[PDB]
Amino acid sequence: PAIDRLLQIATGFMASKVLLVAASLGLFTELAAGPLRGEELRARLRLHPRSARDFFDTLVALGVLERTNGAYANTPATAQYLVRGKSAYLGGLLEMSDARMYELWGRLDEGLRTGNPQNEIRTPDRLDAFQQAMTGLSMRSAHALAEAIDWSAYRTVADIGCAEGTVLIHLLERHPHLRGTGFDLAAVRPSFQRRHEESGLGDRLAFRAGDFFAEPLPQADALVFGHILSNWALPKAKTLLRKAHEALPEGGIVVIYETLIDDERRENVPGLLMSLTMLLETPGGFEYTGADCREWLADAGFRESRVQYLAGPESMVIATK
Amino acid sequence: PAIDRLLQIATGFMASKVLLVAASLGLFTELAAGPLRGEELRARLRLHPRSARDFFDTLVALGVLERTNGAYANTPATAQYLVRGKSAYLGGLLEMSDARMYELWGRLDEGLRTGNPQNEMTGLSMRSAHALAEAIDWSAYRTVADIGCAEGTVLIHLLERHPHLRGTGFDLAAVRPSFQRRHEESGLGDRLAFRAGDFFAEPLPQADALVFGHILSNWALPKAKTLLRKAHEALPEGGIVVIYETLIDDERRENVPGLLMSLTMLLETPGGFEYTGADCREWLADAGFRESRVQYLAGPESMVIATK
Ligand SMILES: Nc1ncnc2c1ncn2[C@@H]1O[C@H](CSCC[C@H](N)C(=O)O)[C@@H](O)[C@H]1O
Ligand SMILES: Nc1ncnc2c1ncn2[C@@H]1O[C@H](CSCC[C@H](N)C(=O)O)[C@@H](O)[C@H]1O
Ligand SMILES: [Cl-]
16 A cells, blocks of 8 residues: 555664664674674674664665574675775765764754754764765766767866866776866865876876866866755856856867756655755755756856766756857 | 665665654645645745755655645545544654654664663554454453553454453553543443553453553563463463564564564663564463464564463
């Protein structure tokens, strides 16, 4: 019945917390070498004997742990993605959800009532892990972005608000004819340059320190805005599109990607939940639809635009000057 | 990919809070009389304009509201079961989750580390009550006592369903007012009585059948076995004890509701726990009951029955 599906979603915070706590505990990392019996896993996590078995078996019943003859083991997904120290480790996402996001969303009612953010504005190694996970998700968007656009038509690309440069680096690795410029605040420069040095791209990639609310954007054939316009109130986003249009040549493109809401605002749960995340986290940020963005790009003067799926929950709007 | 499913479970607290806040705001009760445009719904709920449309549309995307021409309406399920004031209302589970359980489960880590609790319905009991009345041949018995009866919903339904029965509700004295109200509502008169007491301090009422609905799981195992001993002492030869719980499956690898309930018991009680049918049958045999059986009762709730 539909009411059963609804109650299951409404009480989803419990199953959520089980996985979140397991990640915060590093439970899956303790099983990376091989299976462990219940008492050994409990002792390594320093859990009380009262509920350790229940906790482990809940993970088994949720499909994220295996158990055979009293010994628990990783599933293929947790061995691959929830083992700390591996290059593919995404557990930092869950670690940050457990440490911060879970309680932040506990203030949804007050954010909805006041319209005001409910995080630190209202009031160590987990940040590295979370940043590793962000770089991971960024890489997925970057792999798709490299294949979704005919990059042979362009010679230069500028990533606006590039952070550590993951998308830009992967783009230039997949398309060796491209030259790239990452644009971000000066404080981002060392993280970006460490990835630049690791990539071996050399002079093909540069960083420009800047504030995009106070100076022009680098000229390039393609400008990329990944998770940029959504952080700000709309007049500030339109300012950025004007600067993008001024930075581009004729036939150059702007690429905007976000966890966009579907145009009819009735299908895309992750995009709509992200709009609520922007409520809780920023003064004026917001998630939007592709159709919203196409209207802004038309106001800014772009000749044409289209919405296109990217990967995971991400999609993009591409416009031509 | 199974990893995409894992990540959807892990972040399920977001969609959960959307629904919980909706239920605590009575949003579906506001749409009970008819559809409303977003602004009118925003005004009636006292929500800020920044995010009201996002919130309403998330509920549409989750499939619990419908929207057309800018007007929102209940779905059939939310009109049938999430509208306050109706006897079928199931939203009390959601309201208490939003007020208490969401943040309580935020302390799951401390519970697991310390083993200590971290905390310091009539409709949902009615589904079990109806199933209990139909799953047991109550014509074989004359009297029934419900041990820890709360407001008496299950016992009242049994007596309404089987008019030959005489019933006794047993609970702490503080529960008696709420029992008396439901007893007065039922018109059952002399066929139903409340007995105040503490089942760890005094014997249980004698009856042909004793019912333990969501009792044993609240207590450490020695105390649960003590209750089964007292049930054996209170029953006649051929009498039955009826236990119902959201039992974990015997292999302890599939029943997510039962396993989550055991963690709920961790967070809420000093020594309670969820258990399996096989567990309960062993306890019943140790207590001297002749025979026992486990059957599904109603959705996630199962029943263990034993005969003296
Ligand atoms: N005023 C400003 N000028 C330049 N960059 C800014 C800025 N304000 C914020 N940023 C940058 O914008 C980025 C937003 S996070 C987005 C990072 C990346 N595009 C991705 O998709 O993962 C941050 O790296 C932040 O440093
Ligand atoms: N020591 C005690 N003596 C008698 N009743 C007790 C008790 N300790 C707890 N209880 C009762 O046990 C009940 C547990 S809640 C379960 C209520 C009911 N059987 C149902 O399924 O809905 C509460 O009503 C509480 O009042
Ligand atoms: Cl150029």
